[PDB]
Structure 1
Amino acid sequence: HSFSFYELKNVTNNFDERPISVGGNKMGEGGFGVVYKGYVNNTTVAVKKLAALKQQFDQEIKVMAKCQHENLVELLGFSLCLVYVYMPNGSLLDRLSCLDGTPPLSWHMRCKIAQGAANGINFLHENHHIHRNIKSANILLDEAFTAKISDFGLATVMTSRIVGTTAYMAPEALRGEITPKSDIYSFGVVLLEIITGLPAVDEHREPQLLLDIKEEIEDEEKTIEDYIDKKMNDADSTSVEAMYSVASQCLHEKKNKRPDIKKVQQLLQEMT
């Protein structure tokens, strides 16, 4: 579908730069532009205006064309700007940390969300794409807490253009390799946030990289029961352990000893 540049301008209040907490329209910055909240019809949307070019814009509609799925954020139209379905429960990161007073997701909800996201990735790999920026601030959540994977701003194969989010990137990606096995790794870190509710990196914490607690647990310096998010009363040891063992595997260092995303679909489905 196609939108008017005049329309988008006025339903976002001439691109009101103020944060929505203040009463403006600025939902965030990312994906190589700023994201404003808009009202088209009697429905809310996400309007992205681009900023540090045309190359990045035409590609986003190329990748969005092939890949539409229940657990990917659906594009609606274009214009220079872009338009997405609006996810009013925000990022999984916002929810895992109860940003702004929201109540802690239950274990059941978290399990549904993992399974959900993992279907998103399986769809991208089925259709031979690599996300290259899987992280919990790019897993958005709609009115039903369905997982919707956002920011496709990056969607042997080498490169001198190394990019991603270092707290989440796998070792082979840090060096420049582009492979689906890297998305599994990053997805492994997203699982550890869901189990623990802790950030993937924290300057004032030991270990600073969440992905390091895995070593602490192999060396039996700790047990999973020590990192489990305590802001939740329906988690059972059995299925928590089972999810961890999946996180752990996505986290192997040798890219070929990692599970493909279809085997993650099973291990998580077999978890309920």
Structure 2
Amino acid sequence: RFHSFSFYELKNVTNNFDERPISVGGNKMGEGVVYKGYVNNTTVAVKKLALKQQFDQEIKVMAKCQHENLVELLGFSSDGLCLVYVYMPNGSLLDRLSCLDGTPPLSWHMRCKIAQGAANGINFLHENHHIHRDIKSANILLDEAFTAKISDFGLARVMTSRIVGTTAYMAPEALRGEITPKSDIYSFGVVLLEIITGLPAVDEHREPQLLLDIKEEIEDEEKTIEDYIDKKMNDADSTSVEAMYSVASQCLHEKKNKRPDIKKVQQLLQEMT
């Protein structure tokens, strides 16, 4: 299954949980807090949790779901809570879309591969009867080849009394307390809009504040998808951009039953390229 690490082992490999960023010679990737570690010539991501149910749920889902587009869990620590993963050198899709820390903008070609990869990851989760509940660009990680890897299965799983997730990405019924794989489809629709536009899902100093509202402006003919295409690309073609927008639009249907299933989303993204 997974390797059982003692807390002392993870303490040393992260250089005593060096809270300084990587750029200043520390071990912090970012925020629990994520630290870069080195174990048996292999680079690892150690998430020190700062909660026990989310630790147990992450281990349970990870043991059942192993896929090319899912982040891989290597081990854990519970003596004296840490989760050890395969390290993703290119961080999150949110960070790469915002060009955080001077990284070059992602090309349209890279963005298409990322969208396909993320859809393949969600498909595997849904085939294994799991609902993510927090699909967003911050939860889509990028490996050494910029392959998309869905992360954070702490909230993975019908009604609930504890509404959890990210408001800007959440489906109307998810905000109402419902738990359905169709809510993950809606959230992926927001991610597709972030990929096309390079804009975050929410920006308080922006008009409109929420990205999913651009779908209304396009449908009401107030604007077009061309007006919203990320200008930080030089290789975007109208056909494939409209094809990705069509998938995003279908995903963002307010009525959950009118949304396509992940298999259809996966099919439409493959046809796009």
**TM bucket normalised to smaller:** over 0.9
Asked whether the equivalents of residues 55 and 154 of structure 2 are also in contact (C-alpha less than 8 Å), the reply is no
Cα distance in structure 2, aligned partners of 1:48 and 1:227: 36
d(CA) in 2 for partners of 1:253 and 1:220? Answer: 19
Matched position secondary structure for 1:17: coil
Contact 1:106/1:234, CA 8 A, preserved across alignment:
yes
Q: Residues 9 and 124 (structure 1 numbering): CA distance in 2 closer, same or farther, change over 3 Å?
A: same
Once the two structures are overlaid, the 10-residue window that deviates more, 161-170 or 41-50, is 41-50
- Indicate if the aligned counterparts of 2:57 and 2:155 stay in contact, CA closer than 8 A: no
- State the distance in 2 between where 1:9 and 1:198 align: 37
C-alpha displacement at 1:4, in angstroms? 2.8
Stretches of structure 1 lacking an aligned partner (at least 5 in a row) = none
The Cα offsets for residues 178-207 of structure 1, whole Å up to 9 and x where unpaired, read as 000000000000000110001111111110
Query: Does the C-alpha gap of structure 1 residues 155 and 15 become closer, same or farther in structure 2, counting only changes over 3 Å?
Result: same
Percent of aligned pairs sharing the same letter: 99
Query: For 1:113-163, what per-residue CA distance to the aligned partner results, in whole angstroms no more than 9, with x for missing partners?
Result: 000000000000000001111100110100001001111121191111001
How many Å separate the matches in 2 of 1:54 and 1:232? 42
Gaps of 5+ in 2: none
> Are the aligned partners of 1:156 and 1:177 in contact in 2 as well (CA < 8 Å)?
no
C-alpha spacing 1:93/1:54, structure 2 compared with 1 (3 Å): closer
Partner-residue secondary structure (3-state), 2:223 = coil
Change over 3 Å in CA distance of 1:53–1:236 after alignment to 2: closer
Q: 1:127 to 1:38 in 2, by over 3 A?
A: same
| Normalised TM-score (structure 1) | 0.95
SS at match of 2:258: coil
Tell me the alpha carbon deviations over residues 35-93 of structure 1, each in whole angstroms, 9 at most, x when there is no partner.
1111111121001122x443332222111111010000000011931100000011011
Structure 1: distance between partners of 2:207 and 2:145: 35
The reply to whether residue 206 of structure 1 matches residue 204 of structure 2 is no
- Would you identify which runs of 4 or more consecutive aligned residues in structure 1 move more than 4 Å? none
Count the aligned residue pairs. Answer: 268
Deviation of 1:235 (Å) = 0.7
